[PDB]
Short mmCIF file of C-alpha atoms and ligand atoms in Angstrom, two decimals:
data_model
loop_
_atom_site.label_atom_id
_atom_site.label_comp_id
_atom_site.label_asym_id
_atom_site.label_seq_id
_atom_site.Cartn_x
_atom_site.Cartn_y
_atom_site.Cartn_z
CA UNK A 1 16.62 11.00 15.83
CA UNK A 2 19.89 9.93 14.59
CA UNK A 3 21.55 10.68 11.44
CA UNK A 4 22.10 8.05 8.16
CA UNK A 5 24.05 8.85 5.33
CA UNK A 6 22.23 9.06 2.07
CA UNK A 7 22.62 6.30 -0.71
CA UNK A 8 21.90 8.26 -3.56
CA UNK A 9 22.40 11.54 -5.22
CA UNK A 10 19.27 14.15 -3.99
CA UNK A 11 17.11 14.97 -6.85
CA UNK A 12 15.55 18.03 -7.36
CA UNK A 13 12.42 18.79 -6.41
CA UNK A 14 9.52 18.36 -9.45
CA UNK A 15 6.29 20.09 -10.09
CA UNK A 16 3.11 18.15 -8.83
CA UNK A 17 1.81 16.38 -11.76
CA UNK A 18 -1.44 14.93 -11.10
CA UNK A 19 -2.25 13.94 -14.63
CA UNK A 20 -5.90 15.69 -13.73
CA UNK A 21 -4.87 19.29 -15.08
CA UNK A 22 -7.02 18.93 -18.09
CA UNK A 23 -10.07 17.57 -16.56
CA UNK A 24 -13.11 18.89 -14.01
CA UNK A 25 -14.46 16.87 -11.43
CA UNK A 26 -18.26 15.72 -11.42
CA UNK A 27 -17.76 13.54 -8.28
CA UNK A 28 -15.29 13.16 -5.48
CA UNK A 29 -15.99 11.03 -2.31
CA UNK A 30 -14.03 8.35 0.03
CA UNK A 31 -15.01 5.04 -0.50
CA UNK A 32 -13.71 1.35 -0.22
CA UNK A 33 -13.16 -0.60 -3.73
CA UNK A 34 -13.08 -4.63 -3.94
CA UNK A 35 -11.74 -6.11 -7.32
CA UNK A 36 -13.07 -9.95 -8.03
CA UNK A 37 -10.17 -12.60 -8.35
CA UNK A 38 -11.31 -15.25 -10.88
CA UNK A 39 -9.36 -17.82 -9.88
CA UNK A 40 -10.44 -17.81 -6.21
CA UNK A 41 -13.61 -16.52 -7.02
CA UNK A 42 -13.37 -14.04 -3.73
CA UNK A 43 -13.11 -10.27 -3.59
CA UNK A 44 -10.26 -9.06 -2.16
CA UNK A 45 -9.98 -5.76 -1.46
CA UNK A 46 -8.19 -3.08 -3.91
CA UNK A 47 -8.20 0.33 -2.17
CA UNK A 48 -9.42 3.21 -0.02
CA UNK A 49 -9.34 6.66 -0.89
CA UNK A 50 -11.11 9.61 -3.10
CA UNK A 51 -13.57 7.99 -5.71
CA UNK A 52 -13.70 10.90 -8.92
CA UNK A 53 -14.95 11.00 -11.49
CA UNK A 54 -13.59 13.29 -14.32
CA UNK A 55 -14.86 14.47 -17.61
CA UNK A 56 -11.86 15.93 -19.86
CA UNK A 57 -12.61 19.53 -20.82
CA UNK A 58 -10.95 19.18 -24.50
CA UNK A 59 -12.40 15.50 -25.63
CA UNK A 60 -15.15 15.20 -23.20
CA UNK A 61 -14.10 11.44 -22.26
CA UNK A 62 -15.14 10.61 -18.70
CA UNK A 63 -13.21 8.46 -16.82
CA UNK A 64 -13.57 7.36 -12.84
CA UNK A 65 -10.29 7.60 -10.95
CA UNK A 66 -9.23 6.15 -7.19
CA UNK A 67 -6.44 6.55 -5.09
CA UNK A 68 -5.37 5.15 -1.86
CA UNK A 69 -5.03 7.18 0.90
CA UNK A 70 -1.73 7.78 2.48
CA UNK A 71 0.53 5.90 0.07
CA UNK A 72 -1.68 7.39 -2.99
CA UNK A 73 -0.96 5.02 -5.43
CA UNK A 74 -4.09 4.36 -8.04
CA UNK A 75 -6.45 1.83 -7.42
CA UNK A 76 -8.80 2.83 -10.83
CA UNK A 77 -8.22 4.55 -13.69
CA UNK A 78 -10.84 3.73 -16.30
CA UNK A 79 -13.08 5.21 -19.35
CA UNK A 80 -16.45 5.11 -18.02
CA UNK A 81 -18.73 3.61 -21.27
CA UNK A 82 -22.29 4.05 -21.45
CA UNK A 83 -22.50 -0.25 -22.28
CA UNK A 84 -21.25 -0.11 -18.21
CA UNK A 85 -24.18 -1.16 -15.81
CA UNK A 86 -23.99 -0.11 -12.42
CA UNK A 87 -25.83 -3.23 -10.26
CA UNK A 88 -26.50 -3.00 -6.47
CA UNK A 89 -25.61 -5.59 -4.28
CA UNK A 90 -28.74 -7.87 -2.67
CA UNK A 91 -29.95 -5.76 0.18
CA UNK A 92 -27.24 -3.58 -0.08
CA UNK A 93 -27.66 0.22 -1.06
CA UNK A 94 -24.44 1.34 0.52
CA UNK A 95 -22.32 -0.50 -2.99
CA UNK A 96 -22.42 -1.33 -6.70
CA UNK A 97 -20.79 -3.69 -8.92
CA UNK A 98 -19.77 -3.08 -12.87
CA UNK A 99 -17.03 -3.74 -15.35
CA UNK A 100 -14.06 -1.79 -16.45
CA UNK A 101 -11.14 -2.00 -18.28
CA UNK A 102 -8.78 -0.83 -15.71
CA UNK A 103 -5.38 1.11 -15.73
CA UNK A 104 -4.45 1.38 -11.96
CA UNK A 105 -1.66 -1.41 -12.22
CA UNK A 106 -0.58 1.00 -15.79
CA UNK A 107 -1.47 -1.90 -17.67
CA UNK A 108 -5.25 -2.83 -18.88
CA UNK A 109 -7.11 -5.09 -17.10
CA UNK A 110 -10.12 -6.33 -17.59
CA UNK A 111 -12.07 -6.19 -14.10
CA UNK A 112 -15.01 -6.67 -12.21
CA UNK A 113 -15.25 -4.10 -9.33
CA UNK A 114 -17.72 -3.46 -6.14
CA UNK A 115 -17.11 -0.15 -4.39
CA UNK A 116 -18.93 0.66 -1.18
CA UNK A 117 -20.17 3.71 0.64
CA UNK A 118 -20.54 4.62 4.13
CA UNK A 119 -24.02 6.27 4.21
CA UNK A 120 -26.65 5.83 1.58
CA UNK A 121 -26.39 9.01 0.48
CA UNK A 122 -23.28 9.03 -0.41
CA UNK A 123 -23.77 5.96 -2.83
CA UNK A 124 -26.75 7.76 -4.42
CA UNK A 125 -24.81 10.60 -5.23
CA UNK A 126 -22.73 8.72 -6.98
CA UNK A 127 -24.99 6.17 -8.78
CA UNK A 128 -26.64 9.29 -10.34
CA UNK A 129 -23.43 11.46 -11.49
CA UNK A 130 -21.66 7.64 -12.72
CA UNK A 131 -25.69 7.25 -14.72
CA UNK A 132 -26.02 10.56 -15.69
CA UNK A 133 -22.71 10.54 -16.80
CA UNK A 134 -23.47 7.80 -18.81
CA UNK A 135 -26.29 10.09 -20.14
CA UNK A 136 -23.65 11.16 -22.90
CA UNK A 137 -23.41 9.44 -25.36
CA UNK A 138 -25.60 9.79 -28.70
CA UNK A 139 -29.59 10.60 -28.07
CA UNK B 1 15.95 4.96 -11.78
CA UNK B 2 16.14 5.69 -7.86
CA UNK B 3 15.77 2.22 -5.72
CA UNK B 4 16.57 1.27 -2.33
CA UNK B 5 16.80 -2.68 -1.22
CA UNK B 6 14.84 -3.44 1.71
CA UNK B 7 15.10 -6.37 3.75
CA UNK B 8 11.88 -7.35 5.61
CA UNK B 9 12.53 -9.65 8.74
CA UNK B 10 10.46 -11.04 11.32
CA UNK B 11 9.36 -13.92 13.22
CA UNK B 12 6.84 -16.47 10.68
CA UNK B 13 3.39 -15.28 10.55
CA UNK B 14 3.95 -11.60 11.81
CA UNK B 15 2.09 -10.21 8.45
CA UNK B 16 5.41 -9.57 6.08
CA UNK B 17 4.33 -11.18 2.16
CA UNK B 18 0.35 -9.43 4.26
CA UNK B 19 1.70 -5.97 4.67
CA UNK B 20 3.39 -6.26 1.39
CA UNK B 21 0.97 -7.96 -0.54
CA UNK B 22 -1.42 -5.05 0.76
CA UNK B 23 0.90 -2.62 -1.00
CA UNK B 24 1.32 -4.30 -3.96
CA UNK B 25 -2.28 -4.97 -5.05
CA UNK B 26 -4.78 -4.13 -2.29
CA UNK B 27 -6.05 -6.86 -0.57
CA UNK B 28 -5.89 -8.54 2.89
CA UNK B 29 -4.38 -12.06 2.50
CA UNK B 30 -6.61 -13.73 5.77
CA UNK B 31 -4.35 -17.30 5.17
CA UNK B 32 -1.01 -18.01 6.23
CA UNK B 33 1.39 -19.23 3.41
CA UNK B 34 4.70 -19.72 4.75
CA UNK B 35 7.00 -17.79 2.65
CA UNK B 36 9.48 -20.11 0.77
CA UNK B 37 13.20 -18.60 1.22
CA UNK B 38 12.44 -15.00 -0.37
CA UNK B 39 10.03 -13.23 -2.68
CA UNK B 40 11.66 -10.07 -4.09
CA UNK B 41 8.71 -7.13 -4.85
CA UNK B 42 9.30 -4.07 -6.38
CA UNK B 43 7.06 -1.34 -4.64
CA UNK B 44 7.04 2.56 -6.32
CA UNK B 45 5.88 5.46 -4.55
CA UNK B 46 6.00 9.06 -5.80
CA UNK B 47 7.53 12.15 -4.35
CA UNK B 48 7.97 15.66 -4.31
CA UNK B 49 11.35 15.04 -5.81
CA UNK B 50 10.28 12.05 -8.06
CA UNK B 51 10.01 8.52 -8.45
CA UNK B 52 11.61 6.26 -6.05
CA UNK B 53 11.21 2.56 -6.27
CA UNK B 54 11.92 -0.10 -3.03
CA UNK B 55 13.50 -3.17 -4.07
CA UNK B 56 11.87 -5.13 -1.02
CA UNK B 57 13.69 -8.63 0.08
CA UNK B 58 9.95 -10.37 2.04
CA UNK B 59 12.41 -12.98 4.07
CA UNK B 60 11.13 -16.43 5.39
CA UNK B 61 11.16 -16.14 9.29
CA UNK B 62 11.63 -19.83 10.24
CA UNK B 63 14.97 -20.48 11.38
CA UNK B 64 16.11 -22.96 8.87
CA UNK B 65 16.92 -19.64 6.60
CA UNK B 66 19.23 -18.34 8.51
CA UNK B 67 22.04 -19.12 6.73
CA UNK B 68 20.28 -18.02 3.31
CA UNK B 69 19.48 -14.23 4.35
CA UNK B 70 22.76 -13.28 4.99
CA UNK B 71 23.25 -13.74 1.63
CA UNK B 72 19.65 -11.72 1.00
CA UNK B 73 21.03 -9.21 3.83
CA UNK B 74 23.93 -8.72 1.54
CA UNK B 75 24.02 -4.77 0.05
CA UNK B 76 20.80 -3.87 1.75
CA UNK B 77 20.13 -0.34 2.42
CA UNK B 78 17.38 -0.78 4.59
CA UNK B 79 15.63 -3.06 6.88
CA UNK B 80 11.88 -3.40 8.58
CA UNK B 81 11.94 -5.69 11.29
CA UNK B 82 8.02 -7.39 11.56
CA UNK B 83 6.48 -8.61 14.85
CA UNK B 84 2.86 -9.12 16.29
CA UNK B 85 1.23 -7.26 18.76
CA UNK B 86 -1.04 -10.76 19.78
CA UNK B 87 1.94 -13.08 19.88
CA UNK B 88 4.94 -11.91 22.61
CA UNK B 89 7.15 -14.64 21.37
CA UNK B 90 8.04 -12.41 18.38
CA UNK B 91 8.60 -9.19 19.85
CA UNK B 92 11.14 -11.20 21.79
CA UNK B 93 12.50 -12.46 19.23
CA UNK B 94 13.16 -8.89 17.60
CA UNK B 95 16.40 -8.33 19.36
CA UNK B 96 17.93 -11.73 17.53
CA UNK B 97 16.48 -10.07 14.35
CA UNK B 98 18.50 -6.59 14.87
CA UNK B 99 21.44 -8.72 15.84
CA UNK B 100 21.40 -10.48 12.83
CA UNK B 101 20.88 -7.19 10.09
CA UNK B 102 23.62 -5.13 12.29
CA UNK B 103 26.15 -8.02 11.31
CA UNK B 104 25.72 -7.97 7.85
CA UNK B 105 25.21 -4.24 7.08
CA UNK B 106 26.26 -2.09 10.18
CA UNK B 107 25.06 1.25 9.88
CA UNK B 108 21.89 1.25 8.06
CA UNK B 109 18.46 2.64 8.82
CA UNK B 110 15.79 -0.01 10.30
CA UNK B 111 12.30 0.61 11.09
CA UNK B 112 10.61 -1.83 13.73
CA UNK B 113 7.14 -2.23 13.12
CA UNK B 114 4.09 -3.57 15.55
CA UNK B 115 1.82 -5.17 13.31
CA UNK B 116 -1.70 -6.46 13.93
CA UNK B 117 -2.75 -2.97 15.96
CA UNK B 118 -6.31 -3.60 15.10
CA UNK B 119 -7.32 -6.74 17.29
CA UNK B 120 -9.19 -5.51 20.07
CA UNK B 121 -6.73 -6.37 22.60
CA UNK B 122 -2.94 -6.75 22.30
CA UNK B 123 -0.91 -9.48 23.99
CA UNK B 124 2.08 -6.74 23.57
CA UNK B 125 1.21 -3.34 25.49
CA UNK B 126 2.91 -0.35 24.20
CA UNK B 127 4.40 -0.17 27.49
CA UNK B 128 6.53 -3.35 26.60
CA UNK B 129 7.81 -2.28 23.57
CA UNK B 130 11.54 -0.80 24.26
CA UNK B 131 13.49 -2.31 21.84
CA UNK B 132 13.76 0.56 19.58
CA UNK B 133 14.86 2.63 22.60
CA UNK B 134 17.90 0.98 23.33
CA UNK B 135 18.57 0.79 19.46
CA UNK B 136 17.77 3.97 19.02
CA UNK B 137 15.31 2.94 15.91
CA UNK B 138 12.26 4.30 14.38
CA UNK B 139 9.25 2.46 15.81
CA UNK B 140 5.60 2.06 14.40
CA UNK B 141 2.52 0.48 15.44
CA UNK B 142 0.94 -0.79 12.24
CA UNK B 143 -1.74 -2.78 10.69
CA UNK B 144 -2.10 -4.35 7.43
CA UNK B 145 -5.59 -5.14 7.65
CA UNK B 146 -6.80 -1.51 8.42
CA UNK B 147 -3.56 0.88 6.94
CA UNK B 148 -3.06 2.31 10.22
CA UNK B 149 0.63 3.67 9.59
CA UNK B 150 1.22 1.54 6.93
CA UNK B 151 2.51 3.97 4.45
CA UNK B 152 5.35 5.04 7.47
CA UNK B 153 8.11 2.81 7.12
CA UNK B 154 8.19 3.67 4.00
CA UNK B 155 8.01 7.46 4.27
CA UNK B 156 10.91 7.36 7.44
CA UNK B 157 12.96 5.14 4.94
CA UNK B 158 12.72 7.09 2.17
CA UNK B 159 13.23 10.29 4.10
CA UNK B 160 16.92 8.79 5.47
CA UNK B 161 18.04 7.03 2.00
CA UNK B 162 17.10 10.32 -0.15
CA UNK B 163 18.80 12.77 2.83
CA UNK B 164 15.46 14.65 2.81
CA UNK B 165 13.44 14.84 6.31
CA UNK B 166 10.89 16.48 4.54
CA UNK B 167 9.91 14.41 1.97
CA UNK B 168 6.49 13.96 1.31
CA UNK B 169 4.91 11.13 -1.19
CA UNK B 170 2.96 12.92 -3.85
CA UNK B 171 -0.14 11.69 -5.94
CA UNK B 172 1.11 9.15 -8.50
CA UNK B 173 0.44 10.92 -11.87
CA UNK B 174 -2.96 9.38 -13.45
CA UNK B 175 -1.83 8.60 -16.98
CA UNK B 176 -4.55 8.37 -19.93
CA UNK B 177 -6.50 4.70 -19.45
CA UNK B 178 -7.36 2.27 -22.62
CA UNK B 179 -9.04 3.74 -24.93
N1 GDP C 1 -5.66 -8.98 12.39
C1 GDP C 1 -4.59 -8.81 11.57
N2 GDP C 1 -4.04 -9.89 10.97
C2 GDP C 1 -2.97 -9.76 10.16
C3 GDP C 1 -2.39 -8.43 9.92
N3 GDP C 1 -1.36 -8.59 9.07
C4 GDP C 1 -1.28 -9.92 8.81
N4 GDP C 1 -2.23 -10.61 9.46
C5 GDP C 1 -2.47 -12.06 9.39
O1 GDP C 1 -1.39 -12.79 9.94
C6 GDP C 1 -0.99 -13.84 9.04
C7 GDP C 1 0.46 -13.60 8.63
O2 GDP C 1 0.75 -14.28 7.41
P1 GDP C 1 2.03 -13.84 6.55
O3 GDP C 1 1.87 -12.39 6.21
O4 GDP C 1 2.28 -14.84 5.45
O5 GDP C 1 3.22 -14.00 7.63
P2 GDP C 1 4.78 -13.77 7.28
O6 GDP C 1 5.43 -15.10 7.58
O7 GDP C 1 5.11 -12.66 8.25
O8 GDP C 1 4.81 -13.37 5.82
C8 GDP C 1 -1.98 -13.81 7.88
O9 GDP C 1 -3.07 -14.68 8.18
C9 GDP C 1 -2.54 -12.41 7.92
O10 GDP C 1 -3.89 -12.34 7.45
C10 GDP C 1 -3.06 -7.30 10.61
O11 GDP C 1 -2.66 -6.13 10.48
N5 GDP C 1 -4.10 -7.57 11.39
F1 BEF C 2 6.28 -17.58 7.28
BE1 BEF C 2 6.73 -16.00 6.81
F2 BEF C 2 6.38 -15.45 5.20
F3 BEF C 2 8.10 -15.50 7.75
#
């Protein structure tokens, strides 16, 4: 309700960069993303939000891209490779596991990562467009 | 560079270094480490009209500090003050908190936040939580374990500091990964 002075001069409003403008989407879903911690050796949870998975129209690079819901900050940023291997958890066809080189923190990481779906379905849907984007490269 | 330093108070154990750890990285801390004086965490969020960055001050809540955080109180622009829905001990404690902000830095904007929202059943009904009333502050049930409001303080802070009630945060721009 009541009134604060500001602390800094107002900036203009910008243009909404996304950073996406160049690529299409193969896959977009919610889902719930785990990074491994090493030292620990526990996951710990990374983020919640829109999994996608983008192939650049110009270079054709794929990448898979989260970010968190309501703060939308990045949680993954990563080249998909075809050397990746997406590995389902014991009894578990809701999640998969793989590693990436990661770019959320805008600095490369090396990472293991487990992302989970709510239904079945919605993991299967993305096992196949993550494998069949995999399907490039070479033959 | 925009930046805003923002003091987080609260009674120990009320989910301060959890709620900003959660920020920061992701995860959900389940142990108590008893924060040691002050950790200072820079935490960027993007906007319609750019980049702004909180400078946030995650204060030790034992008592024994209360001589150091005036001196961490000391040119901040902004406060949360922490407490926990399952322990009533530290939403009485919150006045003391709001006491000892307005003393250091009058008139600034302060947030008090309800943490812990997503245990079944609260020890602190929304019905006893007044405080902000009588302060006239913005008030927000939160969790750090689930995100429920967790993005808010932030947002309601940011939308006083900048002078723009209509502030939204944007997507952070995905930059080009490794390779
Ligand atoms: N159930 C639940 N527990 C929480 C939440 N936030 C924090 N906690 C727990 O409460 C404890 C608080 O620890 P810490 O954040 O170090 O307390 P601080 O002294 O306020 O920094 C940790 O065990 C957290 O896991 C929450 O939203 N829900
Ligand atoms: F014990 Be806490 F980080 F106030």
């Amino acid at each position: 309700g009541p009134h604060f002075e500001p602390v800094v001069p107002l900036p203009d409003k910008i243009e909404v960069k996304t950073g996406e403008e160049d690529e299409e989407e193969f896959f977009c879903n919610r889902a719930k993303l785990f990074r491994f911690d090493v030292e620990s050796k526990e996951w710990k949870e990374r983020g919640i939000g829109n999994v996608k998975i983008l192939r650049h129209k110009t270079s054709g690079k794929i990448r898979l891209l989260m970010r968190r819901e309501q703060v939308l900050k990045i949680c993954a940023n990563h080249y998909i490779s075809p050397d990746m291997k997406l590995t389902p958890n014991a009894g578990s066809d809701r999640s998969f596991v793989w590693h990436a080189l990661d770019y959320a923190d805008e600095l490369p990481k090396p990472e293991q990562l487990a992302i989970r779906f709510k239904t079945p379905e919605e993991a299967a849907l993305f096992k196949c467009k993550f494998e069949e984007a995999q399907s490039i490269l070479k033959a | 560079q925009v930046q805003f330093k923002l003091v987080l108070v609260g009674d120990g154990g009320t989910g301060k270094t959890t709620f900003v750890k959660r920020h920061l990285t992701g995860e959900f801390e389940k142990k108590y480490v008893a924060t040691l004086g002050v950790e200072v965490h820079p935490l960027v969020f993007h906007t319609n009209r750019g980049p702004i960055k909180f400078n946030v001050w995650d204060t030790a809540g034992q008592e024994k500090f209360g001589g150091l955080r005036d001196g961490y109180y000391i040119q901040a622009q902004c406060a949360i003050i922490m407490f926990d829905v399952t322990s009533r001990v530290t939403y009485k404690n919150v006045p003391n908190w709001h006491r000892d902000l307005v003393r250091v830095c009058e008139n600034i904007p302060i947030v008090l936040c309800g943490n812990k929202v997503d245990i079944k059943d609260r020890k602190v009904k929304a019905k006893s939580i007044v405080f902000h009333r009588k302060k006239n502050l913005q008030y927000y049930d939160i969790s750090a374990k689930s995100n429920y409001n967790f993005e808010k303080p932030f947002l309601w802070l940011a939308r006083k500091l900048i002078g723009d009630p209509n502030l939204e945060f944007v997507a952070m721009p995905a930059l080009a990964p490794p390779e």
